[PDB]
């Protein structure tokens, strides 16, 4: 950097600490990733200076000819990537993409059916302390208590009993492929719209490693960050018939001016995702998650659902008599970043939990492969099986440092 | 830039067009400004890679030690700048800052009193196609038909009749100082909270050139961009007693993960605003607006309210028999950027209007002074008084090019 170090030493020192931290730790938090230098340069551009309320060619302010080109590049590349008929690349976040779909199809107090928050559903899928739960009446479907796979008969029974106006499929912590075709079949049976929130798996969807929700859902929401490896922000995909309403929900509905510099970065990330090497990257993400899962089972760990079909896995720590909070804390002591995460039918609260969630998108971006996954599992086994040994923790620290250089 | 030109020629060419456009035009849109290189570098940082839901020292994820330092720098510098007891620097935009205050104090269908949208109120102050108007019952107060100054007796009569739960003061197109003390006196009379949306005037407030709403309002919302000259985003200021509720409204209430790289940029902009040269800058903004106003009146233009006390002015184009839409279009032909804007009691719709809104924050940032304001007014007079003369428009183009180099 050139001007920040001189204008603001305090902010610059903190950023530099964060940059070095990203390199030194082993990032296993499933929602994380490292964006390219080109994506960062796009969001570090002069596009932050432009007001551009409205849409390309339909703006409220003049002088938007060149930010219009950027926004269209983002929309057209998104459409090529996911095969959607319409894209809205203005959502400030995944939360705002969800908020706008809800604002489009629901009235205050309408019934919504989404995944149980303890089984993998997201905060914006009905938490009582989130706007979703406050504004609407959310009901939940769960996973099977033994297989930990969504119970599609439970989705259908809840739908038929509660008659939701909207059904939400997808999750922040579900390690198996979701059957969007069954979700649409149930939605049609009860006359509900189907919304798929693919935030966690969007990069896998783009690389063809997860079934695409686009053909089955009326609305698809997502973050541009996460497995898609874009800048932090949101996006909505939908059929041509809801395009005008979705665009109006975003603006003048729920947001004001869009972040054009972040939209430029979304276009950049979409161009990267359209390339063949992104598909090779995504395959390594899923391959690494399978490998890591297997290596952890080899150390004696129990995994929710027995493994994974995607980028993430959940360790049920009950057999080791540990809470997710204890495991997260001791792994933090050795340089391994995970987050505690409730598991299906968890006996512990969401602030303690009996599990940890792990994803491989970030370590895959940094070049880790199968041999690194084996070592990561071996380190986690060493630590979690020896939480009271400072000897074991120091060894883990040295093995973590050997992986990160 | 280094990596963007090679990774994405299309996005890079469009950004470069936009950068050159920002230099070549005379930006008079009142909400615009040009941020520093340090602010852009902060938002172009690796902080986009970090999830940090929650607040400093109270995060849901580990590894937030250094983004915590950045967020606290933003909160503490905001508090020094505005003298507020609490700051929330997570709002993704001014719209989301407003949404969170509304989510904090109001229930669905509650009555809110805000400034008439045709007289200066913002979209998020009750437009029927915005969430504010859809979620709540907005009633409006107006300005005097001749002086164009807020009628404080009308604010009080509407408050006493409608018994709003919340009163909103401030605007996107009001050229005079707002009396927050009278707004608080009325709010107290009817037992309503007072929210001040200072987005447009936050830089003037910070430099002491506009009365500060902090001591009078329960909640203060703002954009970090605009006169404050920060990155695009929002912020909420409030007393200690509403801090926990405001923080909960932002998260887990209405947003998900915050944009830590943008928060770093907010801190940078706040540090710039705390410096003596920002105060000199702000004075030149108001001085230039007064000068421009006077020079326009010298050309024969009528200004709403007869002038300005801040960074913006509104030209009532009725005397020249022009709509704001016609004036905006012909000024765009010569390189001068303005936006059509309804005027109080406008006979034309909001899509046509009888006025143009003009602000000096952006041209002041680029170094323009009093002599430049005189020339800008002279060019606007030449163009708007000779809309059918291609001769006059070509002369204006050459005079605009002489100012921008
Ligand atoms: C991450 C996520 C979100 C919200 O995204 P933000 O950018 O944090 O607001 C919504 N839904 C799912 C399924 C997610 O994983
Ligand atoms: C600009 C503005 C907003 C909204 O800001 P965004 O960043 O465009 O969402 C809200 N209120 C006022 C008074 C404004 O000027």
UniProtKB/TrEMBL annotation, chains A, B:
The record marks 225 as: Plays an important role in substrate specificity. Keywords: Amino-acid biosynthesis, Cytoplasm, One-carbon metabolism, Pyridoxal phosphate, Transferase. The keyword Hydrolase does not apply. Pyridoxal 5'-phosphate 1 binds at residues 51, 93-95, 122, 172, 200, 225, 257. (6S)-5,6,7,8-tetrahydrofolate binds at residues 117, 121-123, 240, 349-351. Pathway: One-carbon metabolism; tetrahydrofolate interconversion; Amino-acid biosynthesis; glycine biosynthesis; glycine from L-serine: step 1/1. GO terms for cellular component: cytosol. It is found in: Cytoplasm. GO terms for molecular function: glycine hydroxymethyltransferase activity; pyridoxal phosphate binding. The modification N6-(pyridoxal phosphate)lysine is found at residue 226. One of its GO terms (biological process) is glycine biosynthetic process from serine. The modification N6-(pyridoxal phosphate)lysine (covalent) is found at residue 226. It holds the Pfam family SHMT. Its cofactor is pyridoxal 5'-phosphate. Pyridoxal 5'-phosphate 5 binds at residues 51, 122, 172, 200, 225, 257. Residues 5-380 form the Serine hydroxymethyltransferase-like domain. Catalyzes the reversible interconversion of serine and glycine with tetrahydrofolate (THF) serving as the one-carbon carrier. This reaction serves as the major source of one-carbon groups required for the biosynthesis of purines, thymidylate, methionine, and other important biomolecules. Also exhibits THF-independent aldolase activity toward beta-hydroxyamino acids, producing glycine and aldehydes, via a retro-aldol mechanism. Thus, is able to catalyze the cleavage of L-allo-threonine. Homodimer. This is Serine hydroxymethyltransferase.
């Amino acid at each position: 950097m050139k001007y920040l170090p001189q204008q603001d030493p305090q902010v610059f020192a903190a950023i530099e600490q964060e940059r070095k931290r990203q390199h030194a730790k082993i990032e296993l938090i499933a929602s994380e990733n490292f964006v390219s230098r080109a994506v960062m340069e796009a969001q570090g551009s002069v596009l932050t200076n432009k007001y551009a309320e409205g849409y390309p060619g339909r703006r409220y302010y003049g002088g938007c000819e060149y930010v219009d080109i950027v926004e269209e590049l983002a929309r057209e590349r998104a459409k090529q990537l996911f095969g959607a008929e319409h894209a809205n690349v203005q959502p400030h976040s995944g939360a705002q993409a969800n908020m706008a779909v809800y604002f489009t199809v629901l009235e205050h107090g309408d019934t919504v059916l989404g995944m149980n928050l303890s089984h993998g559903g997201h905060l914006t899928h009905g938490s009582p302390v989130n706007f979703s739960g406050v504004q609407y009446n959310f009901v939940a479907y769960g996973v099977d208590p033994e297989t930990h796979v969504i119970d599609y008969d439970d989705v259908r029974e809840k739908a038929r009993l509660h008659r939701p106006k909207l059904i939400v499929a997808a999750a922040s912590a579900y390690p198996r492929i979701i059957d969007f075709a069954k979700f649409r079949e149930i939605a049609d049976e009860v006359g509900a719209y189907l919304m798929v929130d693919m935030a966690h798996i969007a990069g896998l969807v783009a690389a063809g490693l997860h079934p695409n929700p686009v053909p089955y859902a009326h609305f698809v929401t997502t973050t541009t960050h996460k497995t898609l490896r874009g800048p932090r922000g949101g996006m909505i995909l939908c059929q041509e018939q809801f395009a005008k309403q979705i665009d109006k929900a975003i603006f003048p509905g729920i947001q004001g001016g869009p972040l054009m510099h972040v939209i430029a970065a979304k276009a950049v990330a979409f161009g990267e995702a359209l390339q063949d090497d992104f598909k090779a990257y995504a395959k390594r993400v899923v391959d690494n998650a399978k490998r890591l899962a297997s290596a952890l089972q080899n150390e004696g760990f129990t995994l929710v659902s027995g493994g994974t079909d995607n980028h993430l896995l959940l360790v049920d720590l009950r057999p080791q008599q540990l809470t997710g909070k204890t495991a997260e804390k001791v792994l933090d002591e050795v340089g391994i970043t995970v987050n505690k995460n409730t598991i299906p039918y968890d006996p512990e609260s969401p602030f303690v939990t009996s599990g940890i969630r792990i994803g491989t998108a970030a370590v895959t971006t940094r070049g880790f492969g199968l041999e690194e996954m084996d070592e990561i599992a071996a380190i986690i086994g060493l630590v979690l099986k020896n939480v009271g040994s400072e000897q074991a923790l120091e060894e883990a620290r040295q093995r973590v440092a050997a992986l990160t250089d």
